Design a protein around this ligand. Sequence first.
Ligand SMILES: OC[C@H]1O[C@@H](c2cc(O)c(Cl)cc2O)[C@H](O)[C@@H](O)[C@@H]1O
Ligand SMILES: OC[C@H]1O[C@@H](c2cc(O)c(Cl)cc2O)[C@H](O)[C@@H](O)[C@@H]1O
Ligand SMILES: OC[C@H]1O[C@@H](c2cc(O)cc(Cl)c2O)[C@H](O)[C@@H](O)[C@@H]1O
Ligand SMILES: OC[C@H]1O[C@@H](c2cc(O)cc(Cl)c2O)[C@H](O)[C@@H](O)[C@@H]1O
Lengths: 813, 813
Amino acid sequence: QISVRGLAGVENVTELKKNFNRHLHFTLVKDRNVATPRDYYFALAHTVRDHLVGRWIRTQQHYYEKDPKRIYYLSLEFYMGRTLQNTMVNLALENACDEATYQLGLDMEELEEIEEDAGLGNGGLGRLAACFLDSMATLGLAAYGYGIRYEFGIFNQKICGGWQMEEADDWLRYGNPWEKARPEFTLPVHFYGRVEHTSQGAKWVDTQVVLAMPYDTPVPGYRNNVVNTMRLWSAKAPNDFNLNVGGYIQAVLDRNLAENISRVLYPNDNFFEGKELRLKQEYFVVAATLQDIIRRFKSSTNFDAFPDKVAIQLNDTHPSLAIPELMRVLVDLERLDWDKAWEVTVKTCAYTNHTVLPEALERWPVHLLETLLPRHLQIIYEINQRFLNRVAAAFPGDVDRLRRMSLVEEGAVKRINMAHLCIAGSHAVNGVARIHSEILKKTIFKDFYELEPHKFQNKTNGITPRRWLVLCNPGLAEIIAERIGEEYISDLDQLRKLLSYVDDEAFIRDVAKVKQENKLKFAAYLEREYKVHINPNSLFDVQVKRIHEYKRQLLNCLHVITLYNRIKKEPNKFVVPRTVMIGGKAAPGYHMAKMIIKLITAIGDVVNHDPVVGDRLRVIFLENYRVSLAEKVIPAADLSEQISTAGTEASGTGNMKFMLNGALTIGTMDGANVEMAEEAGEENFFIFGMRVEDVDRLDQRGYNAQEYYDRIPELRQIIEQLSSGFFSPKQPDLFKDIVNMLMHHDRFKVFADYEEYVKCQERVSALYKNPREWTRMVIRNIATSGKFSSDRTIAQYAREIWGVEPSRQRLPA
Amino acid sequence: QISVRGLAGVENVTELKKNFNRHLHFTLVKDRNVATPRDYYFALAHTVRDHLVGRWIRTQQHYYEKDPKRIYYLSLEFYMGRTLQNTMVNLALENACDEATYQLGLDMEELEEIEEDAGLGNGGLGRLAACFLDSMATLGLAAYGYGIRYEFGIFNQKICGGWQMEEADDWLRYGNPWEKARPEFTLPVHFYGRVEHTSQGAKWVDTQVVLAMPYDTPVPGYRNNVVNTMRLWSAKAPNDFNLNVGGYIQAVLDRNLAENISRVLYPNDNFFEGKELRLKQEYFVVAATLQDIIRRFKSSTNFDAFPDKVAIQLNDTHPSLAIPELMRVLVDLERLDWDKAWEVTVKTCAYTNHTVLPEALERWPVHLLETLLPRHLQIIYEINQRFLNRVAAAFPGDVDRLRRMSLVEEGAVKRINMAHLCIAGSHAVNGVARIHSEILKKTIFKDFYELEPHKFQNKTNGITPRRWLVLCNPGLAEIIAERIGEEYISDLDQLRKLLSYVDDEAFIRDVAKVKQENKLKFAAYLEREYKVHINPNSLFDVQVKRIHEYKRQLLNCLHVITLYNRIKKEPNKFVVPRTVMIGGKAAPGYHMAKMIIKLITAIGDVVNHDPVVGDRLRVIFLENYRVSLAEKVIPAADLSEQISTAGTEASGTGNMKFMLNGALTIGTMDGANVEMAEEAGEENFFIFGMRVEDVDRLDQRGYNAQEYYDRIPELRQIIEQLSSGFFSPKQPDLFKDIVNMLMHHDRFKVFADYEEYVKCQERVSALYKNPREWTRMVIRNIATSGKFSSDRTIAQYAREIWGVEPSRQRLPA
Ligand SMILES: OC[C@H]1O[C@@H](c2cc(O)c(Cl)cc2O)[C@H](O)[C@@H](O)[C@@H]1O
Ligand SMILES: OC[C@H]1O[C@@H](c2cc(O)c(Cl)cc2O)[C@H](O)[C@@H](O)[C@@H]1O
Ligand SMILES: OC[C@H]1O[C@@H](c2cc(O)cc(Cl)c2O)[C@H](O)[C@@H](O)[C@@H]1O
Ligand SMILES: OC[C@H]1O[C@@H](c2cc(O)cc(Cl)c2O)[C@H](O)[C@@H](O)[C@@H]1O
């Protein structure tokens, strides 16, 4: 049907059809009379997978023969989403499979909706890892993603009575056709025990053993025939584990204890929970990965060349134990001296920071590490002593600097600062957006920047234009390719050529048409799957992301209520119609976030059923926000809400997704928003609110929310409505905690940005009244979004951190 | 190479080779440079499996269209062993795959040794179910095996310092290519809760739900293109199971609790352990199976025809809850009246008893059933009341009969006698050998036989000649086929034609040659895999079976010691050389059985290292006895030890395996031994010891072991050796418990059969001195083993219990 989706050749379609029928018969053991739609999905999945294997084998054979420097990307999260459509896109199979299935009497889109998301991440950090894997394969890098194969990913969110309910994401229930178990590469991981010192150094003994079994998933590059590997570890008990009948039966049942390590993803985003099971997960991934790395390195004695052949990227502090584990292996097992081992470690490891929020920083209690990883604690202490000796020599007499920079934090409970460990043991440390990286050098890591300025870098985040344009928005990808060709898909900077079409009436009409089509289709989805009615002609105002106080869904709520109150005051006055969509998951233990979800639904209940409002304002909570839902709602959006308090969102990536898909942005100068506005031009962005400097000034003075309440009558009305029980008539005091936090304990200064936000929102509504100029501004956004391709980000990591040159050259098919 | 293994056609071998390479590439994602021998096994397994699927689909399509009466065989155990070779045998693919793999540079036998046993059973009862499935498919019966998919089967046995150590049988580690998960047929199973009474009968409410997910395994018939299904249930938690972060994480981890139901096989053979987890397993299999049965029946309202379309066979009392569960479904859910429901239940269900040992009888505490299955207890009480009302009318005034026949046993703890339940609710009750079935009518079920004589039947056990001749002993199958053709494989009675070859010198030589080849190969195995040296010219004296006091491995031990003592007394006297092999697993909590294993190894330690003995006597404990080991050792045996105390081994099946494979039998007149001796003629069997009547006479008098000790000097010497520490010099009192049990607490009268046993063993050694007459007696055994084919057994069940006619006709290929 459409050009960018590849060729549907006669020979190809015929071959796909016969292989589909083969899998249905031999693989699924069904025929067309008994087959369920899920059987049809699996038949297709297996058919597409067959096209990967040849390329997968020859890519790994290529790396063995050429022996390039290998990149190891260590992460506790890979938010992959669905794999079927992505694989077709990267292999140029989409139109062929579409034709083949059509001739078989099947609708491919319907089959695509059957695949479960691989939800092995919480949000931004997990999705970044997924985008990065795609870009690394597209840029021909010898890269491996290493993580944990969680049996249960991020929970499925159900809304009951306006409240979030969690249910287990049993994503492996029906099987996963994409993974390949590799039990032959099973490795032992050690826990607990004690340290013995001998003539030949230290020994870690009396340990409990857990097995790490790898599962490999192919990562295809974009039409370059490269297929890289994501290797995820699963926890397995050894067969003599804990080994009377009561005794025997119980010993077998106790195997669950060891295997619980890979059972479940911790569902916290941007929040540190110091639980032992989480620490076990962090060591488990690190210990198994490093053994696998060293094994592969030896199968090429001399560890001097290790940093020339290995790069390890630490995704946040979660895999920080890689540093003392590499030291442990090199010193204790390989018998290298400390200084040489440390040189290798530093040159091998690099660290990416993703946050400045104090509650998100990993600080593990010494007593935990003492019991679980006694040898690693000893290595950490020795690392600390030697590091502080350097600090003392560089800044003699500065005793407070020593205490500030220490990896060991003193107090009620002694803790290890994992961020401090990562800086000490890495040759590079980067933030994820220009303003974020500057904040790191100016504030939390200032002392470290003063000691080693060369170590500190910026790598602004990006998103993959394959999943986040071609896959989710084919209609937009097509109208673009009609004008400038297909080359932009792997060179997103080419979108700048679209600036010469900003006055082209044909193109303006096509951009607006594609958006309208996306909006209509998404409006149908909401009726079909959630029985909700929306006006497709209204402005689609959307904030989708995890529920957090810093992301200020509450500020959005205040604006929504303002619009409702202004309508009730002057009902017969014209307003630009809006559909306000807010979606996202709250961490199960985050009470305030759960209260915010309830508030949103409570507002919808009042607003959506007021006859006076009509279809001029609708408030909808998007249930179970996840990658597959993002792929639907993002192409349908007109307005992207990126309204975190300045200095709190390290980068954001959802912002970049909306920009690429034809939405305009209302946002603070926070994270990547600053660079987005710089690229598009500030006149083509709806910027409002305090800058980081203004937040700082307010904190020095003291933030007093009452001041805003006293001086803004519209704001006072909202607070009085919330307090009195307007949005909860049966439970008048339901929202007392929210009002209290806003009035007395608001770390994120919601009131302080309220006035500017509302006024900026008025400017949005005014522009939307003029479809032609709205669309022209949209075109200027899409055209300047090229910087935010993860291909650019990864090319920067490759050249400036890993010391490898990306390649766009095809491998033979 | 050999005829019975089928044709190796040019077109077939070429097709097998290309499909092998396809699977290696597309399925295993390997090439010939990286492939492990395990990859080669899996490539072959997948290749052979492909040939099953067409037949599997058309068999189940056939049953849908023809709608025959369906046989449901309910068992907690299916001891399947390996599947690859069995599948090749039944499909006539063995020579073709042998040729195909040879041309690929691979040894097929080596690949076959890589497959794990499916060890989902303990011994005789589990293996019987497996043999039965094979025969039901070979006889074209619409039959389904229903059980539990245990994650861990029977433990692997390791011998350390002469002691049994258990380790988890992680048989699914590498995956199981034979099974097909069917999550679409997932069914809910209820536990706990309470009973509410309404206007419309009783309701079972507030229950905990566990999901039952089926996995289907194909069961091929012998060259008839029939492929039946074994459906095994796996336990799964619902997604809202148990559904704060501590709270959230723990709730997910607690899913293990529900899923523990299918985790592990209880490793007791012939022994009742009244544990709650076992009760849950029994209900789980019953509840899911019955829903599946009724679903299939409705997909053909009127339950009058239910018994015409459904037969349920209960394998021992383990699935006895099928009776009250069928009543529950019919009465509570389908709203049938009690009397009509009961009529249907009785006509549907039949019960097979496998034991008379009191410790093996299932008697569940009322308090357990009250908490776990409150509605079923109510139904059981009502069944009991109505049954006892019939007893009271038939035998008026006989109050003690009422108490004896009651399903409810009074005492310290009230219990439900599950055997009594099964008789009441079944239209047929059978024992597993003629003497066993007579013992049932004369002793434990005498009252029930008096009430309903028509209900009681015999069905003598059998074994499948496919696995237990063609598969494990191709050389013997071939020399037989050369003389009488191939028809005997599915009509074992034809072996009688071999009686006309008992004086044929060519055949005599061939039978002896095949045995010698088997012995040599097995002697090599022991060196290669266990570093033990044996004389292949010695008599192979073997007792393989579970370790139990009733099976009297101890009596064997006494004979072994007697031979050793007689050699030490007259060293320069000639004796027929023997290799005594004893193997089998002990239940983990069975202390005495574990002591017997230690005794056997202790005897070996002394005997095997005495220079005076030389290679005239060797004692070897066969580690980890299981189906795959049985297939090796049984064809290599000369003498089969079947020496249980008369009246204790219900049938035995190992006995039949040895008879078919050219070993002579030394045995008591117990279980099937009686019928074996009757078939072959008593002169061709080495019978010794007390008959059942003699045991009874001894019990009436009082068994006094001291009498035998006082009157038999050879026996006295052995006991004094055991007591003084001759077989345990470092631990003189190690075997004190064994001596004590033998002297004071021997339920199985070991001493009473000692004299006759030793004298009978002398007659064996004498015959072995004359190879020609030994072999002629062997031929007379093999020739009369036809009765003990499970094809005969199943044909009898079909005609006399299930009311269906077996068929030998091919389905179209
Ligand atoms: O984003 C994944 C897919 O979503 C599809 C898609 C988008 C929607 O807005 C709705 Cl409501 C349903 C749907 O299947 C798109 O049609 C398809 O082009 C895209 O590839
Ligand atoms: O019983 C299974 C298989 O056992 C094989 C077999 C028998 C043995 O005694 C030993 Cl030691 C090893 C072995 O692989 C037989 O050669 C083969 O004919 C048979 O099919
Ligand atoms: O770098 C990817 C994203 O990581 C986010 C992020 C930071 C963090 O410490 C933990 C998690 Cl789970 C996470 O998603 C940042 O908040 C966001 O600014 C950034 O865009
Ligand atoms: O019927 C098969 C076999 O079942 C055996 C048997 C009986 C029983 O109650 C429980 C188990 Cl696990 C078992 O294997 C009998 O002991 C044996 O005589 C018989 O040959």
